[PDB]
Amino acid sequence: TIQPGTGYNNGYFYSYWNDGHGGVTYTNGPGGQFSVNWSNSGDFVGGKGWQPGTKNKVINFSGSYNPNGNSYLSVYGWSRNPLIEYYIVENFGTYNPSTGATKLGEVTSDGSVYDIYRTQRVNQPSIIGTATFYQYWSVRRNHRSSGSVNTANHFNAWAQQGLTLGTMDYQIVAVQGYFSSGSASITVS
């Protein structure tokens, strides 16, 4: 669609990355809109939001999300110091990203209970280069493709459980895929 990279579009930060396998297109639309179309893709992530994010943002999203295979729809971002990759997963495809992960609690927010987990990435790519870092997850039990996410409820619950976030880096609503197919059209605000 557009070239993989980051930048700004109609007031919103955007990030689109892929592994070069092919099979995925990403486009930026008016306002906070973005679309992703994929067919037998590789690894990729794309979406719109903010740089930097905040710890008390109420993120609104709306649209369609039709994965065929392994993909997630999430409020997604990172913190620095400590380096953390985090997800508030609103929907997913064939794989629940918390499969086999250590459960760290539950939090109720925006119409559903979410299960909290912590995982670790070892010597993997990150916003600061190859590194070992933790990932925090809130996985929504009631899947959806529109709604509002009160990020503070998640960040506070994570903190209560000992999952600390550093200074915020980017924070976006993202469609992530791993060797799958699908389509999505989401508007963020």
Swiss-Prot record:
Substrate binds at Y72, Y76, Y87, R121, P125, Q135, Y170. GO terms for biological process: xylan catabolic process. The active site is at E85, Q176. GO terms for cellular component: extracellular region. Residues 1-188 form the GH11 domain. The lineage of its organism: Eukaryota, Fungi, Dikarya, Ascomycota, Pezizomycotina. Pathway: Glycan degradation; xylan degradation. Keywords: Carbohydrate metabolism, Glycoprotein, Glycosidase, Hydrolase, Polysaccharide degradation, Pyrrolidone carboxylic acid, Secreted, Signal, Xylan degradation. Optimum pH is 4.5-5.5. Stable from pH 3.0 to 8.5 at room temperature and from pH 4.0 to 7.5 at 40 degrees Celsius. The chain holds residues 35 to 223 of 223 of the full protein. Belongs to the glycosyl hydrolase 11 (cellulase G) family. This is Endo-1,4-beta-xylanase 2. Glycoside hydrolase involved in the hydrolysis of xylan, a major plant cell wall hemicellulose made up of 1,4-beta-linked D-xylopyranose residues. Catalyzes the endohydrolysis of the main-chain 1,4-beta-glycosidic bonds connecting the xylose subunits yielding various xylooligosaccharides and xylose. The catalysis proceeds by a double-displacement reaction mechanism with a putative covalent glycosyl-enzyme intermediate, with retention of the anomeric configuration. Produces xylobiose and xylose as the main degradation products. Induction: Induced by D-xylose, dependent on the cellulase and xylanase regulator xyr1. Repressed by glucose through negative regulation by the crabon catabolite repressor cre1. Its main location: secreted. Its EC number is 3.2.1.8. It comes from Hypocrea jecorina (strain ATCC 56765 / BCRC 32924 / NRRL 11460 / Rut C-30) (Trichoderma reesei). It catalyses: Endohydrolysis of (1->4)-beta-D-xylosidic linkages in xylans. GO terms for molecular function: endo-1,4-beta-xylanase activity. Glycans are attached at N37, N60. It is found in: Secreted.
